[PDB]
Design an enzyme around this catalytic site. Structure first.
Site: not given
Ligand SMILES: Cc1ccc(-c2cc(=O)c3c(O)cc(O)cc3o2)cc1
Ligand SMILES: Cc1ccc(-c2cc(=O)c3c(O)cc(O)cc3o2)cc1
Lengths: 809, 809
Positions: B350, B541-542, B547, B649, B653
Site C-alpha cells: 500500500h 484525506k488524513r 499529502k 482513492t 471519488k
C-alpha cells in the site's frame, strides 16, 4: 398435560410455532439444519418475551395515567435465577409452549436447561428481593426493582480434589433476551471532588463522572397482566474520559469496573473502595430517576408519591444523597428536606451478626464522597441532640448511638444512619425483630419505639411450588382449586384431607417421582449412584459457621461410626446432601466443604455401609439447583445456633414442598413450628435464652468432649487423620476451633441433635404417618408466602393498598 | 421520486410500514408517544435487515452446495461507514422505505443521520477493504472479510482553539443492529508459552489463551440477491482466566483489550506489543475458521479451494501461522506445507514510505510468538539459499533480501516475509507497481519476476455515486440507463452528450444543488456562512507531510496576499475546505491543522476579502462526511509529492462526482489523466524523475525562498506571527521544516501549483467549458470502479471467474 400449566388452544399453539419459526429465521439468522439447542432456547425465549411487551407497555402507561404511589426496592442483589419458565407460568403459556415445541420436535425441558441463572445475588437477601418483585407485580403495586447489572454474578463453584474452586459467572456471554437497554435514560454519577462553600450554599465540584446506563427487565405478575420493571444500572465511561491516546481508551475500564462483579460475601462486610462505589452508583442513579419520574406527575408531596425500601444497609447512602439533592440542588431547608427523607425511606435489617455490619472508614468517605460525609456529620449532630434532650446526662448512650464510631480509625455505622433516616425499621422474623429491640438497637427503640416493626420473610409460591413442583401443585389443585397460588392461606383446606387415603397416596407418589427425577439428574450431570428409597437429608445454603454444616457433619460421622460398630443392625437408609458456596476468602467455610467431601470419600466407598449411608456435596448450589433438589427433599436441615439466623427462607421452600424440618428455634423456624404445631416439627437444641445462660458462665467445649464418648471418638478421628490419610493434620483448624473458639456452640447442641435425628428415622419407618405430618406442614405453610409479606409492607410501611384485580390484556 | 432508487409498490410500502410498527413494539418496546428519532432509526434498520436474512441464509447455503473456491480478505481495517442506506440501495428498497416512512410521518434522511459510522479504519487502506467487499458481493464471489471488531474505531475529532482533540468513538453504545454474534464459533488463540522439541516434532506449550468470538455482518451485492459475510473477531477471556477473586475477574480486561481500540496511525508503523497481539489474534482465529470450512468440503487441494489476500503486511503472520498448523498440527513435511502456503497467499503493498514499513523487533516475537519466530528463521534460511544459488557471491543481496535485519536490535521485515510466502505481490496503481519493481523490491523482482503484478485501486460506484449523489445518478440514468451502476465502463456513452445543452444544464444543476445542500449542512451543524456561488476547493484525506496540505496552505495565503495587494481587482471566489484527522502522536500533522485554522481566523474575518475567499477546516472527516462534501466539490486537490501516494482513492471519488482534479503525476492520478486526457486535468509539478534529479544534487529550499518573492513574504508572515499574534513563534517548527528538513519538497512545486491554480480559476469563469470538462471526467471514470479491480484480482491472482448472474430471491 396437567391443569395448572394452562390451556393449549389450537390457536395459541399454531401462533407460538409460527413466531418460533419467525424468530429462528429473522432474529437468530438460522434454519432448522444449522440450529443448535441454544438457538432453539433463544427462539422460544423471544417468542415468550413477545407476549410480555404489550402488557409491559400498558402497565407503565397505566401508572402514568393513575399516578399511584411508587415503591422503589433498592437492593445490590437480585437473585433472579432463570426467567423463561417463570414468565410462561405467570402468563399461562406453559402447556401451550410445551405443545408448540413438542410439535416442532423439541423438548421444552431440555431448552429450559440451556438458560443461565441471573445469579446477581449471594443467598437469602438476594432471593428475597427476587420473590418480592414477583409478589409486588402479583399484588398490582407500582413497584420498581433498582440494582446493578453485574457483568459477572456469584461465581460458578467447581469441586477439585474436594476443594471449592471459583470460576467467573459469564452469564451474558450468549446474550440476555430478557433485558432492554435504555441508553436514552443514561445519567451521570459523581465521585471524588471537593466541597466549596458559596453564598448560596455548598457546591460539590471537580468530580469524576461515571455514566449509569439502565437495562429494564420485565417482572410479570401472576396471571393479572401486570408487568413491573427491574432497572439495573451499568457503568459506562464518558467519551471525554482520560481525553497517550491508546492508554486513555484502555483506562475506560477503570470506570466500568464499578458494575463488573458482584461481591461474593454472604453476611460479611468487606470495607473495599470498589464496594462503596457500587453502593453510591446504584443510589445516585436511582434517586435521579425517582426524582425525574416524580417531577413529571412541592416536595411536600414527595413521600405521598414515593416509598424507598432499603434492602439492608447496602444502599444506606440513599439517605445522605436524598438530603444532598433536596438541600444542595433543590434548595430546601435542612429540616424540611429531612422530614421528606425520613417519611420516604424505610430500612430492612437482615442480620445481627457483627461481622456483617457495614462500618465504613471515614477516610474512604472523605476521599470518595466528601459532601455526603459532611451531611452525615450534620445528621449525627442533630440526632445526638434529640438523644441528649430525651436522656439528659446519659453520655454513654450518646457514644453508643452515634453514627460516628470513635476508635483506631473513625467509621460510620450505616445501620445507625438507616435507623435515623427511616420512618420504619423492620426485621425479617418475629424472634429477630424482638432481638433488634432487646439487644443491638435497644437504644434506638427506646428513643423511637414507633419505628420498629416485624415483617416475617416469605417465598413466592409461583417459583417455589408451581414452577419447581408441578406435580404437587396439581394434586393440591385437584382437591381445592387453583386460587391458592395467589392466596396461599387456602392451603389450610388441605387439613381436611389428612385422613384421605387417596391424597396420602398422591402426596407420597409426587415425592417419590421428584426423588427418582433428582437421582436421575445426579447420574446424568455428575455420574454418582444414589438409592431413591433412602431418606433425602438435605442442607442447602451458603457455607457458614453460624449455619452449622459442621453439626450436620458430626451427625453424619456418628451414623457412620454406629454402622461400623454394629454392621448387621437395621438403620433407615439416608442420602445426606450438603450444598452451598463459601465466600472465596472464608478459610473456615472452604475447610468445611473439604471436610464434607472427605467424609464422602470414606463413607461412600465403605463396603460394610452399602447404600445405607451416602454423603453427597451438591456442587454449584444456585437458584436453578434449589428448584430441583428442594422438591426431592424429605428432611430440611435448619440447624443454625439460636439467635444467629435472622429468618432464613430455604426453611419455607422445603416446608412448601413436602419435606419435614429438623431445626433450632431460630429465625422463621419458630413461626413455622407455631403454624404447623410443635408436634409436626423436629425441634431440638438450645433456645435463645439457653445460649445467653451459657455465655454468661462461659462456653467450655472440653466439657462436652469429656462427657460424650461418641463425640470424643469423632474428634479423635478428625485429629488423627482418619478422614485425611495423606495429610493427617489437614483438619487441625476445624478441631482447634470446635475446642477453643466456637462462637456457635456446635458441641452444646450435639446430643439433642443426634437424638432428634433418631426420631426422624423412626417416623420415616412409618410412611403413612410421615406423609400425614408432611400434609400438616404443607397445609400450614400459607403464612410464608411473600404475598403476605408484601401485603404487610404495603399496609404498614409504604401506605398503599394491594390489589388482585386484573389489568386488561 | 427518482428512478434509480427503485419501485415503491403499494404492497411493498404497506408491508414495510407493518414491519416498522412491529419492530417498534416488539423489538424496541416503544409506542409512538415515547419513541425518539433513534428508536425510529432502529425500527427501520431492523425492518431493512429483515430483507437481508433470507438472501444471507440462501447465499451461504449455496456456497455449501456448489463448494466454490473461497476468497479470504484479511485486513485489520474495514472502513464501512453507515450500513442502512447502502443496504437499501443494494436491495432496491430506497424509494419504498422513503414512501413507507413518509406515510408514518417521518423523514428517512433524518433517520439515516442517526446511524453511527463503523469507523473501523484509518483511511485509504481501510476504505479499499470496504469497497472490495461490496464489489466481491456484486461480482458473486464466495468472499469473506475477516478482521477485528474494535470496541472503539478511529477517534472522533473535535477542534478546540484551532487544535485537534481526540474523543473515543463509542460506536456500539446504542447497539449495532447489523451484526450477529456467533458464540458457537468461538475459537482459542494462544500467546507466549515456549517451544518443546519432541520425537514427533515441535510443540507450543504453556501458552496464555484468549478466545476469539466472531460477529457476522451481511455484505449485500448490488441487486443480485447475494449476501456475503464480514466476520469480525472480539476478544473474550476464558472462564478459568486468573482463576484475590475480585482482582482476577477485573483482570479479564487485560485479555479483552486486544479487540478494544483501532490504532489510529495512517501510513505509520508503531512497534507496540498490543498491536502485534491484534495482528496474531485476527490471523489465528481466521486460519482456524478457514481450515474448518475447508475440512467440511488432502491439503494438496487447499489452494484450489482457498485464496487468502493480505491487505498490507498487517496480517503477514498468516504465512508462519499456516505453516505452523500444516507442519506442527497436520504433520505435513515443510516443503509441501510451503508449496500450499505460497499458492494460497497473496500480498497487496500500500506504500513505499519507509516509516510505514512493519519491522518487528525479534525480542517481541521471541516472547509473544516463540514458534512463529523459529518458522520465520527457517523460511529465511531456505529463501536465502535460493538467492545464493541464483546470484552466487552476491553477499550484499543476501543482506538486503534477508527477512531478518541486523542492527542495534534485530527486526523482522514483514514485507520480505510477505513477498517470500506469497505467489502474487501487487501494488495499487501502475506507477506504484513500477516503483516497487525499480526500487524497494528490485532484488525480489529479479528473483521472482512472475510474482509482481499491478491492481490499480477503485471505488464502489454504489456508495460513491448512487448513494451519495442520487441526482447525478439519475440524470446519467435518464440518458444511458441503469446498467452502468454494475458496469461503470458504460459511462463512456456520456462522451456523446458533451455538446448536449440539456445535459450540460443538468450536470451543472446537480452540482449547484449539491453545493446548496452542503452549504446548508454547514450552517445547521457547525454555524458558518459560505457563498454557494464560489468555487469549492476541497482537500480531504488524513493529515500528512507527504499529502502536502501545507502546499495548499501556501496557495491559500498567496490568494489572500494578492487580494490585499490589489483589493479592487476581480478574483474568482473560492471556499477552500481542508479536512482530515492527524494521528494523535503526529506533532507536525497536528501543527498543520492549527495552521489551517489560524489562516481561517485571519482570512475569514478580513472585511476587505469579503466572501471572495473562505478557509474552512472540515471537522471529523469520516466516510459519512465524504459522502456529503465530495458531491459538493468543484476542485479535487491531489497534491502529494510524486512517488509518495501509492494510489489514492479520494481522487477517484471526486472524478466520479463531477469535480475537476488539480494534482501531481502521482498514484492513480496518472491513470485518471490518461483515461480523461491530460487536457482535461490540472496536472502540475515535478514528475517522479524530477524528484530523483533534485535528490541526486540535493534539495536546497533556501534557493526557492531566495528566488520567489511571493513565497518569501509568506514565510516571513509565518515566522513573524502574522497568523499567531499572541504566540509569535507558534509556527517555528513549520518554517524550520520547510526550510531545512522538507522530505516532500513543498517549495519545489510551489510556482507550478500557483500558476496551475490560476488556470483553474480561468476555466471556472466559463461555466459551460468547465462543465464540458467535468463531463469528460465523469465519462472516463469507469476504470476506477472496484468492480474492475476485483475482476482483475479474481482472474489474475485468485483464479476464480466473476459472475453478474442473480441468485433466486
Ligand atoms: C459469623 C461469621 C460470619 C461471617 C464470617 C465470614 C465471612 C466471609 O465471607 C469472610 C471472608 O470472605 C474473609 C474472612 O477473612 C473472613 C470471613 O468471615 C465469619 C463468621
Ligand atoms: C512520511 C511520513 C509518514 C508518516 C509520518 C508519521 C505518522 C504518524 O502517525 C506519527 C506518529 O503517530 C508519531 C510520530 O512521532 C511520528 C509519526 O510520523 C511521518 C512522515
Amino acid at each position: 398435560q396437567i391443569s395448572v400449566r394452562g390451556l393449549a388452544g389450537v390457536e395459541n399453539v399454531t401462533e407460538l410455532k409460527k413466531n418460533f419459526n419467525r424468530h429462528l429465521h429473522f432474529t437468530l439468522v438460522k434454519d432448522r439444519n444449522v440450529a443448535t439447542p441454544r438457538d432453539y432456547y433463544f427462539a422460544l425465549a423471544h417468542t415468550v418475551r413477545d407476549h410480555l411487551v404489550g402488557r409491559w407497555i400498558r402497565t407503565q402507561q397505566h401508572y402514568y395515567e393513575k399516578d399511584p404511589k411508587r415503591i422503589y426496592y433498592l437492593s445490590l442483589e437480585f437473585y433472579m435465577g432463570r426467567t423463561l419458565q417463570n414468565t410462561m407460568v405467570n402468563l399461562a403459556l406453559e402447556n401451550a409452549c410445551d405443545e408448540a415445541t413438542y410439535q416442532l420436535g423439541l423438548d421444552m425441558e431440555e431448552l429450559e436447561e440451556i438458560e443461565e441463572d441471573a445469579g446477581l445475588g449471594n443467598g437469602g437477601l438476594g432471593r428475597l428481593a427476587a420473590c418480592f418483585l414477583d409478589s409486588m407485580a402479583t399484588l398490582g403495586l407500582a413497584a420498581y426493582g433498582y440494582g446493578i447489572r453485574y457483568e459477572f454474578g456469584i461465581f460458578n463453584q467447581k469441586i477439585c480434589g474436594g476443594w471449592q474452586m471459583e470460576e467467573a459467572d459469564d452469564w451474558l456471554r450468549y446474550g440476555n433476551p430478557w433485558e432492554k437497554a435504555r441508553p436514552e435514560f443514561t445519567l451521570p454519577v459523581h465521585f471524588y471532588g471537593r466541597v466549596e462553600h458559596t453564598s448560596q450554599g455548598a457546591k460539590w465540584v471537580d468530580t469524576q463522572v461515571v455514566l449509569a446506563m439502565p437495562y429494564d427487565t420485565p417482572v410479570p405478575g401472576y396471571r393479572n397482566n401486570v408487568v413491573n420493571t427491574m432497572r439495573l444500572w451499568s457503568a459506562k465511561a464518558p467519551n471525554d474520559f482520560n481525553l497517550g491516546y491508546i492508554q486513555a481508551v484502555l483506562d475506560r475500564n477503570l470506570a466500568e469496573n464499578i458494575s463488573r462483579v458482584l461481591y461474593p460475601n454472604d453476611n460479611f462486610f468487606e470495607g473495599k473502595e470498589l464496594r462503596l462505589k457500587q453502593e453510591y452508583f446504584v443510589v445516585a442513579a436511582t434517586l435521579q430517576d425517582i426524582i425525574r419520574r416524580f417531577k413529571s406527575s412541592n416536595f411536600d408531596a414527595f413521600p405521598d408519591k414515593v416509598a424507598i425500601q432499603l434492602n439492608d444497609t447496602h444502599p444506606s447512602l440513599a439517605i445522605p444523597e436524598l438530603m444532598r439533592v433536596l438541600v444542595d440542588l433543590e434548595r430546601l431547608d435542612w429540616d424540611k428536606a429531612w422530614e421528606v427523607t425520613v417519611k420516604t425511606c424505610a430500612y430492612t435489617n437482615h442480620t445481627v451478626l457483627p461481622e456483617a455490619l457495614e462500618r465504613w472508614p471515614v477516610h474512604l468517605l472523605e476521599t470518595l464522597l466528601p459532601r455526603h460525609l459532611q451531611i452525615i456529620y450534620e445528621i449525627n449532630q442533630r440526632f445526638l441532640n434529640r438523644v441528649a434532650a430525651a436522656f439528659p446526662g446519659d453520655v454513654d448512650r450518646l457514644r453508643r448511638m452515634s453514627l460516628v464510631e470513635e476508635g483506631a480509625v473513625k467509621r460510620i455505622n450505616m445501620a445507625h444512619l438507616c435507623i435515623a433516616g427511616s420512618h420504619a425499621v423492620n426485621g425479617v422474623a418475629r424472634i429477630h425483630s424482638e432481638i433488634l429491640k432487646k439487644t443491638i438497637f435497644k437504644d434506638f427503640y427506646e428513643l423511637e419505639p414507633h419505628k420498629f416493626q416485624n415483617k416475617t420473610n416469605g417465598i413466592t409460591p409461583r417459583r417455589w411450588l408451581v414452577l419447581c413442583n408441578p406435580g404437587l401443585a396439581e394434586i393440591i389443585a385437584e382437591r381445592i382449586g387453583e386460587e391458592y397460588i395467589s392466596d396461599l392461606d387456602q392451603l389450610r383446606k388441605l387439613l381436611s384431607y389428612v385422613d384421605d387415603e387417596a391424597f396420602i397416596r398422591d402426596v407420597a407418589k409426587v415425592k417419590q417421582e421428584n426423588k427418582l427425577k433428582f437421582a436421575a439428574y445426579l447420574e446424568r450431570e455428575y455420574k454418582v449412584h444414589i438409592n431413591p428409597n433412602s431418606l433425602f437429608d438435605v442442607q442447602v445454603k451458603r457455607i457458614h459457621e453460624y449455619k452449622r454444616q459442621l453439626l450436620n457433619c458430626l451427625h453424619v460421622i456418628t451414623l457412620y461410626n454406629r454402622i461400623k460398630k454394629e454392621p448387621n443392625k437395621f438403620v433407615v437408609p439416608r442420602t445426606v446432601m450438603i450444598g452451598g458456596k463459601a465466600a472465596p476468602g472464608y478459610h473456615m467455610a472452604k475447610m468445611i466443604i473439604k471436610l464434607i467431601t472427605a467424609i464422602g470419600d470414606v463413607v461412600n466407598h465403605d463396603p460394610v455401609v452399602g447404600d445405607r449411608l451416602r454423603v453427597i456435596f451438591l456442587e454449584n448450589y444456585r437458584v436453578s439447583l434449589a428448584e430441583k433438589v428442594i422438591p426431592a427433599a424429605d428432611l430440611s436441615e435448619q440447624i443454625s445456633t439460636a439467635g444467629t439466623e435472622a429468618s432464613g427462607t430455604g426453611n419455607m421452600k422445603f416446608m412448601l414442598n413436602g419435606a419435614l424440618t429438623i431445626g433450632t428455634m431460630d429465625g422463621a423456624n419458630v413461626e413455622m413450628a407455631e403454624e404447623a404445631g410443635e408436634e409436626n416439627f423436629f425441634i431440638f437444641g438450645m433456645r435463645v435464652e439457653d445460649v445467653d445462660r451459657l455465655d454468661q458462665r462461659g462456653y467450655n467445649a472440653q466439657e462436652y468432649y469429656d462427657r460424650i464418648p461418641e463425640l470424643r471418638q469423632i474428634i479423635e478421628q478428625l485429629s488423627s487423620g482418619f478422614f485425611s490419610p495423606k495429610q493427617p493434620d489437614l483438619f487441625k483448624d476445624i478441631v482447634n476451633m470446635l475446642m477453643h473458639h466456637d462462637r456457635f456452640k456446635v458441641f452444646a447442641d450435639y446430643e439433642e441433635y443426634v437424638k432428634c435425628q433418631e426420631r426422624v428415622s423412626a417416623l420415616y419407618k412409618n410412611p403413612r404417618e410421615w406423609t400425614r405430618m408432611v400434609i400438616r406442614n404443607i397445609a400450614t405453610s400459607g403464612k410464608f408466602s411473600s404475598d403476605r409479606t408484601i401485603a404487610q409492607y404495603a399496609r404498614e410501611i409504604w401506605g398503599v393498598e394491594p390489589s388482585r384485580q386484573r389489568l386488561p390484556a
